[PDB]
Curated annotation (Swiss-Prot):
Gene Ontology cellular-component annotations: cytosol; protein-DNA complex
Entire-sequence positions represented here: 87 to 298 of 305
Keywords: Activator, Disulfide bond, DNA-binding, Glutathionylation, Oxidation, Repressor, S-nitrosylation, Stress response, Transcription, Transcription regulation
Disulfide bonds: A94-A173, C113-C122
Modes of activity regulation: Activated by oxidation of Cys-113 resulting in the alternative formation of cystine, sulfenic acid, S-nitroso- or glutathione-bound cysteine.
Gene: oxyR
Any GO BP annotation: DNA damage response
Keyword Transcription regulation belongs to the record: yes
UniProt organism field: Escherichia coli (strain K12)
Protein name: DNA-binding transcriptional dual regulator OxyR
Mutation effect (C113 to S/A): No activation following redox signaling
Assembly: Homodimer and homotetramer.
Length: 212
């Protein structure tokens, strides 16, 4: 019927790996006849393939470039601080954002920054934001933090159950708590919009209160 057949879904690298395990089993139960194909690529590549018609829908961090499409907010995901064990802040319980000034921040060119990068910076204006690992990935960042190359912010879904793991300590960032909005995007005027909407609603429901 309405939720049958293939659906090609795109997810950005900083969302896909960590969100899928939470929603795939639920989608298999809610739509037994739906066949999902998952694709991961950077925001620009996903929005181009969505416009081309190669993808049905895309899940990403809503940014300025996704306003030309239909955006359905799914949930707000906070970001936590990741620092190596032997870092001075290791014994703190929370760290205000203003403190990131004069600290070496690792970051990614896509799906990571809190600010649109027309402002000149990614997380904090006075921070020393490294560019050498900008074209890599989230797991690369996590492992370089453990190696002591610097610190960074990671989406909550990418943080292990423990406060400390493999030489990395994860702690809350406050005043204000950094957050990003993950949403489902699709072509406006799309003939199969009813299907995309039902899909977005099922995900919003499952993730509701996940970070409370």
């Amino acid at each position: 019927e309405t939720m049958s057949g293939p659906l090609h879904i795109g997810l950005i690298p900083t969302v896909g790996p960590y969100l899928l395990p939470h929603i795939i089993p639920m989608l298999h139960q809610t739509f037994p006849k739906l066949e999902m194909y998952l694709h991961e690529a950077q925001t620009h590549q996903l929005l181009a393939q969505l416009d081309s018609g190669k993808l049905d829908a895309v899940i990403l961090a809503l940014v300025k470039e996704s306003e030309a499409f239909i955006e359905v907010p799914l949930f707000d995901e906070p970001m936590l601080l990741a620092i190596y064990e032997d870092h001075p802040w290791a014994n703190r319980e929370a760290v205000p954002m203003a403190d990131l000034a004069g600290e070496k921040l690792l970051m990614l060119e896509d799906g990571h920054c809190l600010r649109d990068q027309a402002m000149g910076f990614c997380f904090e204006a006075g921070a020393d934001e490294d560019t050498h690992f900008r074209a890599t990935s989230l797991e690369t960042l996590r492992n370089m933090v453990a190696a002591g190359s610097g610190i960074t912010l990671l989406p909550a879904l990418a943080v292990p159950p423990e406060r400390k793991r493999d030489g990395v300590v994860y702690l809350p960032a406050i005043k204000p708590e950094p957050r990003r909005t993950i949403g489902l995007v699709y072509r406006p005027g799309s003939p199969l919009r009813s299907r995309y909407e039902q899909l977005a609603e099922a995900i919003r429901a499952r993730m509701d209160g996940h970070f409370d």
